[PDB]
């Protein structure tokens, strides 16, 4: 029962020290800073086989939004849920492969439109 976390090119100021009380969920925290496609690939295929667990979750600072695409193409190899956080494939994925598995922690356009209308109402225009 595992989870893995990555910080690529990002100010790696974090320590969990409070996961074992979340009531085993076991981390293996890694922090590259190469912002390299190939390095992402070789690590992810490395880290999966090495860290015999599923469901990695990471984040990043830059915003070359192709990371979502590369990561989803990674998720093309099934049973491999991934889950971005700060960048974590920063911006948004407009659509998705069916067989894939991914999430984004990001607001969809329609929700933003609904917020726009709630404002338009609450301030009487």
């Amino acid at each position: 029962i595992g989870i893995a976390v990555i910080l690529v090119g990002t100010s790696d100021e974090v320590a969990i020290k409070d996961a074992h009380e979340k009531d085993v969920p076991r981390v293996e925290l890694v922090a590259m800073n190469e912002t390299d496609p190939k390095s992402i690939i070789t690590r992810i295929c490395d880290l999966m086989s090495d860290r015999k667990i599923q469901g990695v979750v990471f984040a990043d600072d830059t915003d070359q939004e192709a990371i979502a695409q590369i990561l989803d193409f990674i998720s093309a190899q099934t049973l491999t849920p991934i889950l971005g956080i700060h960048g974590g494939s920063s911006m948004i994925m407009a659509d998705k492969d069916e067989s894939s598995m991914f999430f984004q922690f990001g607001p969809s356009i329609e929700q933003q439109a609904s917020v726009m209308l709630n404002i338009m109402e609450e301030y009487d225009w």
Partner: protein, 188 residues
């Protein structure tokens, strides 16, 4: 056609485009009857990183909506993430006594638990934790996203103004500055 943009005699305007096109259109517009007096604009989150400076022709007002840098307390967010993974694992072991295994690498075609992936995919969306509801549709949507509102001050930066939660709005000032015609009339 942007001349027809002057046909828009409306107080409120909406706009959806990229940052470069935004600068271009704002340039063309501010020249032609597009200003802060008698207008107000709204644009989705894709304008820019708020800390990044905004361009010059980028006028006043420009209410928008996105996450906030404060929302990005990194440790809290990674905690929530590992929590959602763990609670989904617990749920898919509560409704059934089958367990997801460690799997195999980028070696070949091997999809033994592929059917379980769809079954895992099933429980990974209505699973909650810590009282908050961290749910998803099938398209990477936090079904309840912590959003905020921002507008720019004289030229300075973006102010954390309004808070949004489940059709709930925390708002301030009831009032917007015009860069007089607004009169406050008392009654009884």
């Amino acid at each position: 056609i942007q001349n027809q943009l002057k046909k828009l005699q409306s107080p409120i305007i909406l706009l959806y485009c990229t940052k470069e096109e935004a600068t271009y259109i704002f340039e063309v517009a501010n020249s032609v009857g597009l200003t802060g007096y008698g207008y107000t604009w709204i644009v989705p989150s894709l304008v820019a990183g708020d800390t990044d400076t905004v361009p010059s022709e980028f006028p006043t007002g420009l209410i928008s909506v996105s996450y906030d840098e404060w929302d990005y307390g990194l440790p809290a967010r990674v905690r929530d993430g590992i929590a959602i993974i763990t609670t989904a694992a617990s749920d898919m072991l509560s409704e059934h006594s089958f367990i997801p295994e460690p799997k195999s690498s980028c070696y070949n075609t091997h999809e033994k638990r592929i059917y379980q992936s769809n079954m895992l995919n099933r429980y990974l969306i209505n699973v909650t934790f810590e009282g908050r509801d961290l749910s998803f549709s099938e398209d990477g949507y936090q079904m309840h996203p912590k959003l905020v509102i921002i507008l720019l001050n004289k030229e300075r930066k973006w102010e954390r103004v309004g808070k949004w939660k489940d059709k709930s709005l925390q708002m301030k000032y009831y009032v917007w500055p015009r860069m007089d015609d607004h009169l406050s009339i008392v009654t009884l």
